[PDB]
């Protein structure tokens, strides 16, 4: 089997991407944030505290003839941005782009933190990291990809995120028309539960490539590119007037600037992030200070190849017995 679904930016900045997912019988379609940095499929629901729902579409398990309460199971998750959610668990039929999994754990939110409530466009998350990170207790549950894998034509999914435009998540096949050149594959460590890999270096604009190992994670659920402070300082030093602002929470730059590109290495291959992809717009409405899309990871503990980086590439998440990642230009 295969599946193919369009993913759409939630706003004009590409702050996140939503993909329609069918849950239950008859289908209830929710728009989920596909997140290769986590491993829970959770949704706003009929069980979510009413004051914490503000415009999201909810899953109502009592209206699904295939929903079953997973007795005794609860979940609770905290994300790197400080947001969180928790609740109970059903199993139900879940389909993405024509690919169907029966008995998928659908984690129903009883509580969500304010940032989820405040974002009416995201009805939940669909985790695509390794199932070892799934938070369901006392019986850990498998991701949608883990459940589908054996049925797929090939044990892979691909992320093709758009810049200010829709893109595609494919399951079970590699669309050879969706990228240019060849796909360069690179080793993955699953020891932390992430799609963790080592970039071979970077360049700023037309500058020379610096060969240096940068361990980080391919994370579709993180908006920005978070890299070591040395690398980030070298980038922003090429932008007149750019500075790190403790009060704003990162590097800002004059909105009048033209940003240089940023290149990262994948083995001997190179992925170029155009400068425009690094502009996240005014820090507040009407400001001439703009927020940068490359930020320091020094306070995180891990480097994160988030959407800013991934949207410049066609990305293969290879879930073979020994997982690997592939990157192509597009």
Curated annotation (Swiss-Prot):
The keyword Hydrolase applies. Keywords: Aspartyl protease, Disulfide bond, Hydrolase, Protease, Signal, Zymogen. Transmembrane segments: none annotated. The keyword Secreted does not apply. Its EC number is 3.4.23.22. The active site is at residues 35, 199. It catalyses: Hydrolysis of proteins with specificity similar to that of pepsin A, prefers hydrophobic residues at P1 and P1', but does not cleave 14-Ala-|-Leu-15 in the B chain of insulin or Z-Glu-Tyr. Clots milk. This is Endothiapepsin. The gene is EAPA.
């Amino acid at each position: 089997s295969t599946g193919s679904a369009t993913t759409t930016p939630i706003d004009s900045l590409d702050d996140a991407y939503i993909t329609p997912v069918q849950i239950g019988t008859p289908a209830q379609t929710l728009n989920l944030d596909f997140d290769t940095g986590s491993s829970d499929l959770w949704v706003f629901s009929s069980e979510t505290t009413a004051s914490e729902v503000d415009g999201q579409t909810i899953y109502t398990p009592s209206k699904s003839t295939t929903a079953k309460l997973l007795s005794g199971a609860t979940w609770s998750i905290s994300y790197g941005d400080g947001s969180s959610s928790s609740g109970d668990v059903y199993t139900d039929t879940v389909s993405v782009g024509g690919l169907t999994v029966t008995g998928q754990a659908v984690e129903s939110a009883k509580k969500v933190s304010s940032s989820f409530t405040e974002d009416s466009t995201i009805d939940g998350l669909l985790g695509l990291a390794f199932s070892t990170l799934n938070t369901v207790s006392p019986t850990q549950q498998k991701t949608f990809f883990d459940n589908a894998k054996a049925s797929l034509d090939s044990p892979v999914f691909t992320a093709d995120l758009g810049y200010h435009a829709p893109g595609t998540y494919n399951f079970g096949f590699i669309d050879t028309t969706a990228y240019t050149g060849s796909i360069t594959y690179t080793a993955v460590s699953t020891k932390q539960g992430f799609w963790e890999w080592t970039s071979t270096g970077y360049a700023v604009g037309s500058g020379t490539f610096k060969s240096t190992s940068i361990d980080g994670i391919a994370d579709t659920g993180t908006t920005l590119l978070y890299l070591p402070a040395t690398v980030v300082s070298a980038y922003w030093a090429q932008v007149s007037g750019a500075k790190s602002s403790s009060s704003v929470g990162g590097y800002v730059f004059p909105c009048s600037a033209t940003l240089p590109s940023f290149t990262f290495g994948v083995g001997s291959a190179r992925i170029v992030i155009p400068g425009d992809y690094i502009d996240f717009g005014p820090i507040s409405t009407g400001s001439s200070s703009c927020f940068g899309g490359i930020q320091s990871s020094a306070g995180i503990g891990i480097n994160i190849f988030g959407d800013v980086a991934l949207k410049a590439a066609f990305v293969v998440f290879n879930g073979a017995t020994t997982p690997t990642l592939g990157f192509a230009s597009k």
